[PDB]
Ligand binder design. Structure first.
Ligand code: NGA
Ligand code: NAG
Ligand code: NAG
Ligand code: NAG
Ligand code: NAG
Ligand code: NAG
Ligand code: NGA
Ligand code: NGA
Ligand code: NGA
Ligand code: NGA
Ligand code: NGA
Ligand code: CA
Ligand code: CA
Ligand code: CA
Ligand code: CA
Ligand code: CA
Ligand code: CA
Lengths: 129, 129, 65
């Protein structure tokens, strides 16, 4: 509203929100690959990355309580969400990003699909590569 | 554990076939000149109804789609490119490489110069006398 | 094949049985499959019963970690 875009100069920010293909380190807003977890390297800043639970075999009791993938991360049961997906605040549930929600993701019509999207144009139009 | 969205989407994610065991709710009508998928009750454009790729979760689009003569050439109203891509003939000569190989533009005359009946300005523009 | 020339098994035929079978073609009762007793001479009964290795390890089809 303030034409210099300075009214919203102190507005809040979203979480560090590591990509679904990566993991986040508590207290520092830093990201490390999933491969880094449970490997013995101390990737996170103050040793937050490893615990002996890296062998507690939490996954087999019931897929960890997760829909797609379970990794025996430093905090026991940790879950992995595929590309194009996102993880709810419930540390277990994994959901599909509705890409159509962002305005202009594609030119005319957008249809959400599991971890993907498809787009369509009106009859006088066609779609490109 | 499966995300709540999947409970009613027509194809059971839980392999016990216990997702749509009691939901139903097929109460709405998709708009016309379009297609509603037999299971799950979703709306996708008419083009998706029968194309090499399946779209709805139920796959009912391609469940009932003929051979559609796969050996046939693309319609002659379009143009073909080196990478085995077919695009509308109007696109053959413009500013856009409508096919990744750029074989559409490759043949064009490469000159936006103005007719002698006009005047020429440096940035791709011509003006009447 | 206890003899390198195979002359132990070479002559005789084998008696028919069908409750449960072992990799070498030997038969054992149903309960025998997973009781931790080695019923199959080749241990093929117990081999598939339980996971033998931890998550730090990897498991090998031979019953090895
Ligand atoms: C029809 C189709 O495959 N659409 C998209 C694909 O292009 C890719 O973006 C993928 C990423 O997860 O999602 C899906
Ligand atoms: C994650 O892994 C990829 C592929 O091995 C590598 O290119 C990238 O640098 C890694 N990122 C981090 C933060 O370790
Ligand atoms: C650990 O935390 C301290 C503050 O308590 C910080 O100064 C330090 O840099 C951290 N360690 C690393 C490796 O960043
Ligand atoms: C976190 O879960 C609560 C319910 O426990 C929900 O109300 C809230 O919207 C969730 N947070 C976000 C950011 O979705
Ligand atoms: C199977 O059980 C019978 C008795 O019920 C016993 O005589 C036989 O030896 C058993 N078979 C084997 C391979 O131990
Ligand atoms: C026994 O276990 C091995 C290793 O998992 C597997 O290759 C084999 O097919 C199993 N055999 C039977 C009869 O289950
Ligand atoms: C953005 O907001 C989040 C909370 O939603 C955190 O406070 C984070 O530290 C903020 N980041 C910045 C750069 O202000
Ligand atoms: C259902 O869709 C049809 C066309 O298939 C019409 O648009 C109709 O008006 C719709 N009715 C409702 C109640 O959605
Ligand atoms: C393939 O489809 C064509 C029409 O598009 C003919 O109906 C043909 O008989 C079909 N053959 C098969 C095996 O489906
Ligand atoms: C294009 O396809 C048609 C059938 O639809 C004919 O087979 C025609 O011979 C083809 N043309 C070329 C050049 O291959
Ligand atoms: C520029 O375009 C004119 C017509 O606008 C003619 O096609 C002519 O061939 C061109 N001349 C040059 C110098 O390219
Ligand atoms: Ca590590
Ligand atoms: Ca999606
Ligand atoms: Ca379902
Ligand atoms: Ca389709
Ligand atoms: Ca073009
Ligand atoms: Ca036994």
């Amino acid at each position: 509203d303030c034409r210099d875009m300075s009214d919203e100069k102190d507005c809040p920010t979203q979480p560090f929100h590591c990509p679904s293909s990566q993991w986040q380190c508590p207290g520092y807003s830093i990201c490390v690959n999933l491969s880094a977890l449970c490997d013995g390297v101390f990737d996170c800043p103050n040793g937050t990355d490893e615990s002996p639970l890296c062998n507690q075999d939490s996954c087999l009791h019931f897929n960890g309580g997760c829909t797609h993938r379970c990794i025996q991360g430093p905090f026991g049961a940790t879950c992995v969400c595929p590309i194009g997906y996102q993880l709810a605040n419930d540390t277990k549930t994994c959901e599909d990003v509705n890409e159509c929600d962002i305005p202009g993701f594609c030119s005319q019509h957008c249809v959400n699909m599991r971890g993907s999207f498809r787009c369509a144009c009106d009859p006088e139009y066609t779609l490109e590569s | 554990c499966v995300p709540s969205i999947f409970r009613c989407d027509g194809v059971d994610d839980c392999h016990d076939n216990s997702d749509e065991h009691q939901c139903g709710a097929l109460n709405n009508t998709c708009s016309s000149s379009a297609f509603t998928c037999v299971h799950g009750g979703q709306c996708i454009p008419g083009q998706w109804r029968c194309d090499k790729q399946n779209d709805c979760l139920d796959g009912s689009d391609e469940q009932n789609c003929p051979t559609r003569s796969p050996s046939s050439t693309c319609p002659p109203t379009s143009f073909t490119c080196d990478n085995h891509m077919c695009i509308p003939k109007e696109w053959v000569c413009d500013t856009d490489n409508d096919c990744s190989d750029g074989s559409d533009e490759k043949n064009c005359q490469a000159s936006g110069t103005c007719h002698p009946t006009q005047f020429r300005c440096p940035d791709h523009r011509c003006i009447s006398p | 094949s206890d003899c390198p020339d195979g002359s132990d098994e070479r002559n005789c035929y084998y008696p028919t049985c069908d409750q449960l079978t072992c990799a070498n073609g030997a038969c054992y009762n149903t309960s025998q499959k997973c009781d931790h007793k080695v019923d199959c001479r080749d241990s093929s009964d117990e081999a598939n019963c339980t996971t033998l290795c931890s998550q730090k390890e990897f498991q090998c089809g031979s019953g090895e970690c």
